[PDB]
Design a protein around this motif. Structure first.
Motif, PDB file in Angstrom:
ATOM      1  N   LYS A 162       6.244  57.926  74.275  1.00  0.00           N
ATOM      2  CA  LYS A 162       7.526  57.693  73.539  1.00  0.00           C
ATOM      3  C   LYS A 162       8.735  58.066  74.410  1.00  0.00           C
ATOM      4  CE  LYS A 162       7.760  59.773  69.602  1.00  0.00           C
ATOM      5  NZ  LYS A 162       7.742  59.865  68.116  1.00  0.00           N
ATOM      6  N   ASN A 221      20.929  56.607  72.307  1.00  0.00           N
ATOM      7  CA  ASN A 221      19.970  57.521  71.607  1.00  0.00           C
ATOM      8  C   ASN A 221      20.157  57.424  70.090  1.00  0.00           C
ATOM      9  OD1 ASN A 221      19.602  60.525  70.476  1.00  0.00           O
ATOM     10  ND2 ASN A 221      18.211  60.173  72.122  1.00  0.00           N
ATOM     11  N   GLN A 222      21.384  57.336  69.635  1.00  0.00           N
ATOM     12  CA  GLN A 222      21.636  57.228  68.164  1.00  0.00           C
ATOM     13  C   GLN A 222      20.957  55.970  67.616  1.00  0.00           C
ATOM     14  OE1 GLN A 222      25.782  57.219  67.304  1.00  0.00           O
ATOM     15  NE2 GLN A 222      25.554  56.717  65.193  1.00  0.00           N
ATOM     16  N   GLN A 252      16.971  56.677  68.210  1.00  0.00           N
ATOM     17  CA  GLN A 252      16.444  57.702  67.256  1.00  0.00           C
ATOM     18  C   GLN A 252      16.508  57.185  65.817  1.00  0.00           C
ATOM     19  OE1 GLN A 252      15.399  60.904  68.029  1.00  0.00           O
ATOM     20  NE2 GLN A 252      15.028  59.931  69.948  1.00  0.00           N
ATOM     21  N   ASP A 253      17.566  56.503  65.467  1.00  0.00           N
ATOM     22  CA  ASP A 253      17.692  55.979  64.074  1.00  0.00           C
ATOM     23  C   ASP A 253      16.568  54.987  63.757  1.00  0.00           C
ATOM     24  OD1 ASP A 253      19.861  57.401  63.258  1.00  0.00           O
ATOM     25  OD2 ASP A 253      21.279  56.093  64.216  1.00  0.00           O
ATOM     26  N   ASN A 299      12.803  57.637  64.151  1.00  0.00           N
ATOM     27  CA  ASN A 299      12.621  58.631  63.046  1.00  0.00           C
ATOM     28  C   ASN A 299      12.643  57.924  61.689  1.00  0.00           C
ATOM     29  OD1 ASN A 299      13.052  61.342  64.618  1.00  0.00           O
ATOM     30  ND2 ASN A 299      14.373  59.864  65.530  1.00  0.00           N
ATOM     31  N   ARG A 357       7.956  57.493  63.902  1.00  0.00           N
ATOM     32  CA  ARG A 357       8.691  58.789  63.879  1.00  0.00           C
ATOM     33  C   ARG A 357       7.963  59.827  64.744  1.00  0.00           C
ATOM     34  NH1 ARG A 357      10.997  63.276  62.829  1.00  0.00           N
ATOM     35  NH2 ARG A 357      12.506  63.137  61.152  1.00  0.00           N
TER      36      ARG A 357
END
Length: 78
Positions: free
Chosen positions: A23, A39-40, A43-44, A47, A53
């Motif tokens: 990952k 990353n936002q 990650q959104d 996760n 996730r």
């Protein structure tokens, strides 16, 4: 985008021969295929998925459900 590009980049990052990259290469893989998210965004979408996730390494078939499904927004990055 093209599905062939995803296959070449995924296997290249898959230096073990197991059909699954760690990952820690997700962002490093989106740039090699045409996506330049952050990353936002990364990650959104991770996760937010109970399966990705905490997935250790996404398989080649798993990425297709994250590129085609997010084809419009990722392509809009850009």
């Amino acid at each position: 985008s093209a599905t062939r590009a995803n296959k070449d980049i995924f296997t290249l990052f898959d230096k073990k021969g197991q059909g699954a990259i760690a990952k820690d290469s997700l962002g490093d893989y989106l740039r090699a295929i045409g996506y330049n998210p952050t990353n936002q965004l990364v990650q959104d979408i991770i996760n937010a998925d109970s399966s990705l996730r905490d997935a250790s390494s996404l398989t080649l078939d798993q990425i297709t459900g994250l590129i085609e499904v997010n084809e419009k927004e990722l392509d809009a990055t850009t």
